[PDB]
Amino acid sequence: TVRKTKTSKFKWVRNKIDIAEGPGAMNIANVLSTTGGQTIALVGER
Amino acid sequence: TVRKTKTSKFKWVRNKIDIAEGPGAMNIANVLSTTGGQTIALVGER
Amino acid sequence: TVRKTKTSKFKWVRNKIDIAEGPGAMNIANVLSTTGGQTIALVGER
Amino acid sequence: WFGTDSGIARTATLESNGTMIIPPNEQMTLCVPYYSEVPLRCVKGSDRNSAGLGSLFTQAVGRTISNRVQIFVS
Amino acid sequence: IYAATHTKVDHIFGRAWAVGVFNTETAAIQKFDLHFPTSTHGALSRFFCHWTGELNIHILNVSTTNAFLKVAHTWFGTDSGIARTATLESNGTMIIPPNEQMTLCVPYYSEVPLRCVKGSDRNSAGLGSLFTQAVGRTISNRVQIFVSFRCPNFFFPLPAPREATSA
Amino acid sequence: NVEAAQGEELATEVGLRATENDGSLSEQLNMSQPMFLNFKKHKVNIYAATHTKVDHIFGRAWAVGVFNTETAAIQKFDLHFPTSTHGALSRFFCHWTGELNIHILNVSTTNAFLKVAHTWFGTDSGIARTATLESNGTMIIPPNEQMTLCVPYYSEVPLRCVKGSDRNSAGLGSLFTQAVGRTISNRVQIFVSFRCPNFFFPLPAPREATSA
Amino acid sequence: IYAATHTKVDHIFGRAWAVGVFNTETAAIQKFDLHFPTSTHGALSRFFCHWTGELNIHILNVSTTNAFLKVAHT
Amino acid sequence: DRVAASTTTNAGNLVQASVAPTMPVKPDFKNTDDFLSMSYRSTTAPTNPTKMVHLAHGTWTTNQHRQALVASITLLQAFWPNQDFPAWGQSRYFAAVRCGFHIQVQLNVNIGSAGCLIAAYMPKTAHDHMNTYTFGSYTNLPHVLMNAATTSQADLYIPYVFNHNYARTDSDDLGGIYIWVWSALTVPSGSPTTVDVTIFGSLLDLDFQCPRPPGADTVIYT
Amino acid sequence: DRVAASTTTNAGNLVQASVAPTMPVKPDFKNTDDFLSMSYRSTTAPTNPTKMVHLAHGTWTTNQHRQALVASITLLQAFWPNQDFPAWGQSRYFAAVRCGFHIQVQLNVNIGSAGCLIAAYMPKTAHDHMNTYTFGSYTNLPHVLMNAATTSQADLYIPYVFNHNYARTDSDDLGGIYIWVWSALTVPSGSPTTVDVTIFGSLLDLDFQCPRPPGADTVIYT
Amino acid sequence: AFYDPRTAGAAVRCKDLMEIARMPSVFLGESTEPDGRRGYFTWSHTISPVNWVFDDHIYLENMPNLRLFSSCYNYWRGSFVIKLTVYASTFNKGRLRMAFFPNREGAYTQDDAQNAIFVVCDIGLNNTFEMTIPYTWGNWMRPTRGNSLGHLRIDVLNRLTYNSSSPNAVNCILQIKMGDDAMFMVPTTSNLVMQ
Amino acid sequence: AFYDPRTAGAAVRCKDLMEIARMPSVFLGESTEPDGRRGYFTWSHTISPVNWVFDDHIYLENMPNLRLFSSCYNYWRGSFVIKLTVYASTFNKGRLRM
Amino acid sequence: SLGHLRIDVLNRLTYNSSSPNAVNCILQIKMGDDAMFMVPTTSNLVMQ
C-alpha cells in the first residue's frame, strides 16, 4: 500500500504473554489464597 | 429489540485471553523468581 | 561498555509471572463464571 | 439451529459451521449465538424445525475409541 | 438483525476451514501442499484471482505415544533452485507440544506480490507449502491442519466457477 | 541538452575511482555509488521490519544437536557456533559478546524431569566443578515440556571468538544436563538463539569444506 | 563488570542447592531432616552460627503412576 | 588535461587525459526548426508507439451458437506480432512492459439484425483455464455488452492487471480480450450473412525497462 | 449515444453511436510503480536511442604516410547500419532527421610514440569531392588535433549542418567524420606497431518526422 | 553485564550487518592461474579490437563473499556496483568496455553491444571503474540462488600498446560490490557446510 | 508487509464482498440451444397474445453466480432486481409483460 | 421455491421484410440493494 499510516499496526499485535511458576498446585495452609475462591452460589452472593 | 442502546454490549464481552510461554517450568538459579512465592504462613505474615 | 545509561535495562526484563490456583476446572453452578465465555459467533456479535 | 437437513445435506464437514476444538480430558464453556429463521423458539413442541433449541454435532479425531462425552446446557 | 455483518470480507474468512488430514509415523520431513479451499465456505474466495494477506494455520496434534511435532512454512516450494529443506529449524519453525494445538500465523513473504487463487501451478499459484516433522521416537502421531485468512485483500473478480463432477 | 552529460570535475560521480586511495574501509561505505543519466536510487521498504539488521536476524533460532538420554549421569554436551544454517551468517566475525537463549525440548515416553545447567568455563576450571550442577544455575524442566531460559555472559575472556574450536576461550559454551525420576529413553533437542549480539571486527568469507 | 553483585548476601543464597533425594513407595508419613548445606556453594554460609530468615523449599515430584504428594514443615 | 566523464541514458564514458571540446563558429544548438518545414509536433517520435492500430478482425455468422467465440486477441503480444506495427521497433529492445491498455471494439450491423457479442477481458492466470467458468457469469469481468442495433462502438479501458510487477513483452502475460456470442444474430432475407467484427485497439501509459539483445528472450519474474 | 472522437499521436478515430467506456472497480491508472521493482528512470525508453555507441574502429600503422586515411565514418547512416544499434529500431519508421551529433574520438598510444591524427568533419555536399582541397588547410574545418603523447580523448560537438532543412535517415546526407594522418608515428623497438583507433560516438537533440512504411525508402527534399 | 568493545578493534558495535555485503569480492577468484574466464584474467595484445577478453554468467553463488550470504537469505533487492580493475604501467595505454545484459545467457553476437549498459573507459593513473546496475524484475524481490543474473562481456576497443620498458600483457580483476540500497530477505537454511 | 494493490486492476481493496452478488447472472443459461425454459428463450410470432413464452420456477440454486454463493451461506434477505432483455431491430416492435 | 415468473404475449412480434422473424431473449437475476447473507455453512458440492 502506497498509503499506509505508521502505527503499532506494523506488528499486527498479539495476545499478551505470561509465565506460570507453580503449575496449578493447591495451597492449603495460607489463609490469603484460601479466602479467595470459586463460589457455587449463584452470582456469588453473600 | 426495536430499542437497544449501541454499546460494547453488541459483542457480549468475554473472559480475557492470554498465552503461556513456559508451561510452568520451575526456575532455581534466578533470585528474582525465587524471592516471590507461596507462603505456608497464615496470611503470609513476616 | 564504558558508556551505558543506568536504567531498568540492567536486568533485561522478562515475561510477567503468575500463579494458577485451579488448574482449569470448569464451574457449572456459579452464574458469574457462566455468563462470560467463548462465542462461536463470528466476532462475537449479539 | 437448522437440523441436519436445510434442504441440502450441510453436514458434509462441520469445520466451517463454527467448530470449536476440545482437548482430551478437558472441557470448555463455548456459547452459541442465536441464528434462526424463526425469531422465537417454542419450548413445548418437539417438532425438529422450529421447536427445539437446537441440534448438536460432534466427531472424534486421532484414531480412538471409548471417548466418552457429557454435555451440559445453560 | 445482527450487529456484526457476515457479508463483510473481514468477518467471513475468519471462520477457518479444514484442509487435509494425515498420520505421521516417520521423523522424515513431510511435504504437504496447501491449495485454496474447495467444497466449503472457503470456496467463496473462488471469485478472485489476485490475493494478498497473512494467513493463520491451526494445526492439531494427536499423539498416542508422547511426541513433539514441528511446523514450518515456506511460500517458495521445496525447490528455490537449491534444496532448502535440509533442516527446517531456521526458516521459522514453531514447536508444538503433544496433544496440543496452536494458532501460529504466517506473514506474507513472496517474490510475487499477488497470489492467484485459481491456478494449481506450484510456483506462484498456491497460497503455500507446509513442512513438518515429528520428534521423540514415535509413530502414529496424527495431525490435522486448518487454514484461516486474516484481513485478506482480494483483487479483481472472475465469473462464478463451474461445479466439477468429472474432476 | 537533455540526453548528454559532461565532465571534467564530477567524473568521480560517473564511477571513475582510484582503488589505491580507499581512505578507511569504512570510508568506502560513505561513497556514493555511480549513476548514469537514468537510474533511480530509492530505498523501498516492503516490510516494516528489516531482516538485514543484526538484532532481528539472529532472533530466529537454530538447531544444534540431538541426543537421547537413558542415564541419570551428568551429560557433557559442547556447543560450537552454528554451521550449515542461517547461523553460519555469524561466521564473518571473530569477537562476539552477548547473552544467548537456549531452547531445550524434552521428550519423555516414561515421565521424567530433566535439568539444564550452563557453564562458560568447561568441565575443568582446574578443579572438577561438575560434582553437582544444582548450584551453578540449574533450571528444572518438566516432562514433555520446553523452556526459553537464557544464559547471561560470564567469562574470563571478554570476547569469544567464533572461528576457533579451542575449548578454553573459543566456544560459546558447554552445556550440562541430567535426567531424574528413574527413567530411560528420555530424548532432548536443544536450540541456541542469540539475544542482542555484539559482533566485533570482520573476517573474510570462509571456504566451504567438502573434505572437513 | 556486572550491574548486580554476586558478593551481596541477598543475591548469593538466592541460587538454591540440592539436599537429599528419595523415592517413596509408601503412604506412611516420611521423616526427612534438613541439615545446613555441605559440599556446595551453600557451604559459604558455614561462616556464621546464628541465622534467622525464611527459607524456600523447592520440591520436585516424579511419578510413573499418577500420585499426589503432600509437603509440610515443622 | 583532467578526468572527464560522460553519461547518456544507459551508457557512460569515463575518460582520462581529456581535451576541451570544439564547436563550429557561432553555433546554434536549438533543436526545433523555426520557421518549420514540418507541421508535426516534435514529441511525435517517442509518442508514436502509442498510436492505435487495427487488431485481429473476426467473422461472426448465423451458424455460430451462444458461448461460441467470434475472435481472439492475446493482449500484450498483440501490438507487435509483426514488424509492421508502430510499437514493434521500440519493443524489440526493452524486455518488460508496465503499459496500460485502451481497446475500442468496432462493429457494424446492417439495421434490421439482432443479437449480441460480448467483449470481455481475461488476464493470463485466469485465461489458463476456460473449463472452470460458467458462461452465464462472464459479466463479472470488466466488459461491455454490444447490442446489434444502436451500438456503433464499444469503448473499454483496461488498467494494468497482472500477478508480477512487470510483464514480459514477447509473451502473453497480460492475457487478452476474447469476444463471445451472447445471443445468435437473426437475419431476414435478403441480407449479407457475415457480420464483420474488427477490434480496433490502442495503447496508453507507455513503459519499457530492462534492456536485452534485440532478438533474444530473457526471463525476469519466474 | 453521440459522436465520440479519439486521437492519439498520428492516428485518430471518429465514432458514431458510441457507448460510455468501462473500467474495473476502484481503478488506479497512475503509471509509475511505487514501490519500485526497477531502479531505472521511466523516461529511459524514449531516451534510449541517444545512447553513445562504438563506431567504425580503424588501424593506424607506421607504413601509412601523411594525408593518408586511418578510418572513415558516414555520419547519419552510422548510428543504425545494423539491427544491433539502439537507435535503429526507432529509426526504421520515421524518415527524416534533424538530430545533432556528439562524437568522442577514443585513442590509446603507448607512451614513447609520437605522431598525430586529425579528426575533422566534412558535410555531404563538401564530401562529394576530395580532389579540390589542399591538405595543409583542413584545419579550417571544425576539428580537433590529436597528439600521440598526452591526449587520451578528443571531444568534438557537431551541430546540425546541411543544405536542406531536414535530412534523410537511410542516406549519408549529414556527411561524416574522416580521420587523417597529420604526421607519421614513430616507433622505437620493441613496441606494438599497430595503434588502434576507435571512434566512440553518440547522439543528442533527437528528432524524427515524416512516417513511412518500415522498409521502404522515400524522397523528401530532392 | 557491561560489555567491553574497546578491547575489540572497533569501539562501536555493528548495528546492520549489511555493511559486510558492501565489501568487494573477487569474482570466482579461487584460481592461481591467470586465465581466462575465472574473473582473474589476462588482457593481451594478441587480440584485435572487439573480441572477448572475459565472458561468463555471474551467479550470485559464484562470488565468494555473498556465496554464504546467499545461502542464508532467499531473496534480495538493490543495485550492483561491479568494478573492473586493470594494473598497468603509467606508460601502457588502452581502452576496453564492459557490456552487461541483466537476465541473459549465451549472449550477444559479439557484434551487439548497444541496448545494454556499458562503460567505455581508459587505462591511466586511475584504474578501478565502478558501474551500477539496478535490479530488474517483474517481482518486488528476486530469488538469491537461482536463475542467471546475466552476462558481462569485456572486449577490446583498442589493443594494449606495449613499450620496450613496458609489460607485454596485464592481469585484471573483477569485483562485485553490493549496492547502496540492497536489502536481503526471509532467512533460510541451506545444505552447505561451514557456510 | 506493505501490500501492493496497484499491480492489481483495482487500486482500492474490496471491503464488502456483497458487491459481487450485485452482478447480474443469466438464469440457467448453461444451454447453447435457444429454447425454451432455459432462461435463454425465443420470442416468436407464431403465438397469439396471452400465451407463455417462458414459465419456470426460479430456485436460488439455478442461477450460476449465486449458486455457490448460496452454498456458502444458509440464509439471506433483501429484494431482487430481475431484468429481462430483448434484442431486436429498431424496426421490430411488440409488448410483453412479466 | 422462490416462485414463478411468467412471460406472456400482450402483442405478437410484428416482423418486417427487412426485419428478423423472431428474437432471442435473456433473463438475469441481479441481487438487490439491501440483501444480506447470513451464518456461513459448508455444502457437499465440489469446486464451488
Residue numbers in the entry:
A (entry chain C), B (entry chain C), C (entry chain C): 4 to 49
D (entry chain A): 150 to 223
E (entry chain A): 76 to 242
F (entry chain A): 31 to 242
G (entry chain A): 76 to 149
H (entry chain B), I (entry chain B): 37 to 258
J (entry chain C): 50 to 244
K (entry chain C): 50 to 147
Text of the article:
The capsid proteins (VP0, VP1 and VP3) adopt the expected eight-stranded anti-parallel β-barrel configuration and are arranged with pseudo T=3 symmetry (where T is the triangulation number), such that VP1 surrounds the five-fold axes and VP0 and VP3 alternate about the two- and three-fold axes.
Here we report the determination of an atomic model of LV from a 3.78-Å resolution cryo-EM analysis. There are very marked (∼20 Å high) protrusions displaced some 45 Å from the icosahedral five-fold axes, but otherwise the external surface is broadly similar to that of other picornaviruses; being relatively smooth it is most similar to HAV21, although less angular. LV VP1 most closely resembles that of HAV, which likewise does not have a pocket factor (root mean squared deviation for 83% of Cαs is 2.0 Å); similar characteristics between the two viruses in VP1 are: a lengthened βH strand and alternative conformation of the GH loop blocking the entrance to the pocket, while the βC, βE, βF and βH strands shift so that it can no longer accommodate a lipidic pocket factor. LV uses the VP2 N-terminal domain swap across the icosahedral two-fold axis, first observed in a picornavirus for HAV21 (and seen in the insect picorna-like viruses), possibly imparting extra stability at this interface. The external surface of the LV capsid possesses unusual protrusions surrounding the five-fold axes, which extend the radius of the LV particle to ∼170 Å. Although these are poorly ordered and best seen in lower-resolution reconstructions, it is unambiguous that they are formed from the C terminus of VP1. Residues including Arg 6, Lys 7, Lys 9, Lys 12, Lys 14, Arg 49, Arg 62, Lys 64 of VP3 and Arg 225 of VP1 are engaged in interactions with the ordered RNA; of these, most of the VP3 residues are conserved across the genus, while residue 225 of VP1 is strictly conserved. Throughout the capsid the ordered RNA comprises some 900 bases, 12% of the viral genome.
